[PDB]
Design an enzyme around this catalytic site. Structure first.
Site, PDB file in Angstrom:
ATOM      1  N   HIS A  62       0.831  -1.203   0.000  1.00  0.00           N
ATOM      2  CA  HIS A  62       0.000   0.000   0.000  1.00  0.00           C
ATOM      3  C   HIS A  62       0.867   1.255   0.000  1.00  0.00           C
ATOM      4  CE1 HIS A  62      -2.904   2.944   2.030  1.00  0.00           C
ATOM      5  NE2 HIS A  62      -3.428   2.698   0.841  1.00  0.00           N
ATOM      6  N   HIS A  63       1.677   1.419   1.043  1.00  0.00           N
ATOM      7  CA  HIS A  63       2.673   2.492   1.090  1.00  0.00           C
ATOM      8  C   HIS A  63       3.970   2.060   1.785  1.00  0.00           C
ATOM      9  CE1 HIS A  63       0.262   3.073   4.774  1.00  0.00           C
ATOM     10  NE2 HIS A  63       1.340   3.618   5.313  1.00  0.00           N
ATOM     11  N   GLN A 125       9.435   1.050   6.652  1.00  0.00           N
ATOM     12  CA  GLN A 125       8.079   0.696   7.034  1.00  0.00           C
ATOM     13  C   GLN A 125       7.313   0.364   5.773  1.00  0.00           C
ATOM     14  OE1 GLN A 125       5.541   3.814   8.821  1.00  0.00           O
ATOM     15  NE2 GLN A 125       4.932   2.270  10.330  1.00  0.00           N
ATOM     16  N   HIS A 127       3.578  -0.996   4.527  1.00  0.00           N
ATOM     17  CA  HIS A 127       2.193  -1.270   4.867  1.00  0.00           C
ATOM     18  C   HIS A 127       1.542  -2.177   3.829  1.00  0.00           C
ATOM     19  CE1 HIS A 127      -2.203   0.155   4.767  1.00  0.00           C
ATOM     20  NE2 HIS A 127      -2.101  -0.761   5.711  1.00  0.00           N
ATOM     21  N   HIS A 192      -0.086  14.046   7.268  1.00  0.00           N
ATOM     22  CA  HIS A 192      -0.501  12.844   7.950  1.00  0.00           C
ATOM     23  C   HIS A 192      -1.502  13.185   9.036  1.00  0.00           C
ATOM     24  CE1 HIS A 192      -0.349   8.836   9.753  1.00  0.00           C
ATOM     25  NE2 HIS A 192      -0.183   9.447  10.912  1.00  0.00           N
ATOM     26  N   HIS A 194      -5.247  10.830  10.901  1.00  0.00           N
ATOM     27  CA  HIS A 194      -5.974   9.552  10.834  1.00  0.00           C
ATOM     28  C   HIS A 194      -7.374   9.705  10.182  1.00  0.00           C
ATOM     29  CE1 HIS A 194      -3.133   7.694  14.126  1.00  0.00           C
ATOM     30  NE2 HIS A 194      -2.506   7.961  12.994  1.00  0.00           N
ATOM     31  N   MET A 264      -3.746  12.609  14.838  1.00  0.00           N
ATOM     32  CA  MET A 264      -2.472  13.276  14.614  1.00  0.00           C
ATOM     33  C   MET A 264      -2.621  14.341  13.547  1.00  0.00           C
ATOM     34  SD  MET A 264       0.609  10.568  14.468  1.00  0.00           S
ATOM     35  CE  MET A 264       1.480   9.977  15.927  1.00  0.00           C
TER      36      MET A 264
HETATM   37 CU   LIG Z   1      -0.281   8.168  12.931  1.00  0.00          CU
END
Ligand SMILES: [Cu+2]
Ligand code: NI
Length: 304
Positions: A62-63, A125, A127, A192, A194, A264
């Protein structure tokens, strides 16, 4: 593909090499799993990241994010990033989004890593959205010992004390700091948030006049997007951001945190400076000019 015998370091020339940061043949068992793994730098001396090349499995990935830090959260082969990315402050270097293809670093602009003060580790990271086979997806990074004339860096704006009451229509997260460094030039940005976030926007305020840096819908693929026109921020200028949130849907009040049920307000401004003036990372976690947000352009409240 998985690298096998050749190893992760490819010499590019006498003073350049490519480092392949990959997943060590992982197999996810759930949808929306976040995997993290680190790579100590191969050189202890300073070096500059001048280029990135994604190696993502287009089906499952995904990312991808790529950080630099000195203390990765786990001493393991890989881990669930819920354990954390880094113990110390994690610096973002690269964001690969599925439906938003990354922008290249300008030429002559590089991130300084390693040495006495740069990042000693890379943390990758990945995802995995949609899901026996082992996945080795990751980034291939171009390092050079050659000192670059321009240094890349991250100005991070984030909220800490935002509180969103349940069902509440609109909650604004206001971040503001005065810039007290040598000039920087903004060339990219990431937002960024949520699930409660509606719109994020960052500005440069100079003599009361607001110059847009980035305005983005945090629900859209969270890559680094190029600035419409590169923007100098200079000693005296005030950087200002707002995230717009809703409480609708939620049953209890939402604060800032690390879970999905937390929120966030994070604007990553990517910039370059003159190498001899450059510093690599700045952060604003305050709102020093609150009453200044009375003249914030109306666009910052309407959703993109
Ligand atoms: Cu976050
Ligand atoms: Ni300029």
């Amino acid at each position: 593909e998985c690298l096998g015998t050749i190893g992760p370091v490819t010499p590019l020339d006498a003073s350049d090499f490519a480092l392949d940061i990959r997943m060590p043949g992982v197999t996810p068992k759930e949808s929306d799993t976040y995997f993290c793994m680190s790579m100590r730098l191969p050189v202890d001396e300073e070096a500059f990241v001048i280029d990135f090349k994604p190696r993502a499995s287009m089906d499952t990935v995904h990312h991808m994010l790529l950080f630099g830090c000195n203390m990765p959260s786990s001493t393991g082969s890989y881990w669930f990033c819920d354990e954390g990315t880094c113990t110390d402050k994690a610096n973002i270097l690269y964001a690969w989004a599925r439906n938003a293809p990354p922008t290249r670093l300008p030429k002559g602009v590089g991130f300084r890593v390693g040495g006495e003060t740069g990042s000693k580790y890379f943390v990758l990271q990945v995802h995995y959205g949609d899901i026996n086979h082992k996945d080795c997806s990751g980034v291939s990074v171009h390092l050079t010992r050659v000192p670059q004339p321009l240094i890349a860096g991250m100005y991070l704006m984030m909220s800490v004390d935002t509180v969103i009451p349940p069902g509440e229509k609109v909650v604004n997260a206001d971040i503001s700091c005065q810039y007290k460094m040598y000039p920087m030039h903004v060339f990219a940005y990431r937002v960024h948030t949520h699930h409660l976030g509606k719109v994020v926007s960052g500005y440069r305020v100079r003599n009361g006049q607001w110059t847009l840096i980035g305005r983005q819908n945090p629900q859209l693929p969270q890559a680094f997007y190029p600035v419409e026109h590169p923007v100098d921020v200079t000693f005296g200028d005030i950087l200002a951001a707002r995230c717009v949130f809703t409480g609708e849907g939620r049953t209890e009040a939402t604060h800032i945190g690390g879970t999905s049920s937390d929120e966030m307000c994070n604007l990553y401004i990517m910039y370059y400076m003159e190498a001899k003036y450059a510093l690599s990372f700045m952060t604003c976690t305050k709102n020093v000019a609150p009453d200044m947000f009375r003249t914030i352009p109306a666009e910052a409240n309407i959703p993109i």
